[PDB]
Amino acid sequence: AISVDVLTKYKTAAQISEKVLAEVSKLCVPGAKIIDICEQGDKLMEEELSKVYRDKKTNKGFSHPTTVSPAAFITPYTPLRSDEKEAATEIQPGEPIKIQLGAQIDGYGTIVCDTIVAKNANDPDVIEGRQADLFLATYYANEVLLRLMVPPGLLATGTDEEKAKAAAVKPPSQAKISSLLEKVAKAYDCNIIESTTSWLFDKNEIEGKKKIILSPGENIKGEGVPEVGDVWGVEVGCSLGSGKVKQFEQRATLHRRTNNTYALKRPTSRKIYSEVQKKFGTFPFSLRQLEDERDAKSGVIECVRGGVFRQYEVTGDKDNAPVCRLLTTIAITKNGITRIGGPPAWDLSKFKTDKKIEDEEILKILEQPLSK
């Protein structure tokens, strides 16, 4: 069981992340410059952070930089101010924008990601066409995934014999999880984004010792099963295209410190390394967050080459089609699955399409509860 102390720190992080997410989503209007939004989000996060756990030397910070990703972007986007062309990128109207960010208290982080439609306050709320399909695929993929993560039998009802039959059912393989989510996307003629990964979280860790990898494809596979006591960053992504991923040309700015001990030779490497250890610890950060972009670009090179920073390469839809993503931080307890921190529920009434999930296996899963 997760202690009150730990659960409460995750929860403090979630409330901060959800509040910053809401403030950042309001800034995502057509014409807004992405770099301004990320900077403002990061600023908000720090303000919110300074308003809690003030007493004592309680560590705290970002679990994830504010990122704002256009239509076909998969890697969370957070560009440099000194990259003139990138830093002038503006929100395009009607595009699906991924906003992913998060906070961190005493090494317990919550990461959240919502996808919204870029628009002005007095634009219509309705989403239609294949864009409605893209969103609904992602929504239902998420609802299905979350239910596939409830440990077998935890919430089974009925006779003792039914309850025992449920608890003795093996946790679904990751291949089975994948094919079901693919089925969900297909009902909307969308595809799951290859290798979309959910990670176990732990103290100072957002890429823990268990992970679920959706539609792995080839020489890749996830390992580990969700258990009562776990906290997970649960992610789903869909594409109006094939759901294939490809490297784009924007500068990689998203990184995180690893636990590798490689000795850095270059002084700007060590300098940036120490700056990051102190501010972010082992949590993801954007190069734009560092004190000096020129130092950032110089030192990051050896840090990545040496394996002490992990670099998250810039990727986007291989077909250059729009993508949709959700990321929820959950807790698994006695009572099932609780969403500690995530995106605000979507009003399904706003989505307009003829498409519908018809597969019986999937509709049945959707009837299963997430918790008691």
Domain residue ranges in the chain: 1-252+314-372, 253-313
- SS3 call for 97: strand
What span, in angstroms and rounded, lies between the C-alpha atoms of 49 and 15? 11
- State the angle between helix axes of 129-148 and 174-186 in degrees (0 to 180), rounded to the nearest 10: 160
- Give the integer Cα–Cα distance in Å for 52 and 12: 8
Quote the tokens at residue 196.
């979309």
Sign of CA dihedral 351, 17, 226, 229: negative
**Obtained via which technique?**
X-ray
Question: Between 3.20.20.70, 3.10.129.10, 3.40.50.300, 3.90.230.10, what CATH number should domain 1-252+314-372 receive?
Answer: 3.90.230.10
**153 vs 20, 122, 338, CA distance in Å?**
36, 47, 16
Residue that has been written with the tokens 């020489």 in this structure = 219
**Burial of 169: CB neighbours in 10 Å, binned 0-12, 13-18, 19+:** exposed
Question: What are the residue ranges of helices labelled H in the chain?
Answer: 4-27, 34-50, 129-148, 160-167, 174-186, 267-280, 293-305, 360-367
Topology classification of domain 253-313: Arc Repressor Mutant, subunit A (1.10.10)
Q: Which two tokens stand for residue 80?
A: 């440099």
Helix (H, G, I), strand (E, B) or coil at 26: helix
Token duo for residue 53: 């756990």
Q: Which two tokens stand for residue 201?
A: 């979280």
Give the side-chain half-sphere CA count within 13 A for 353: 19
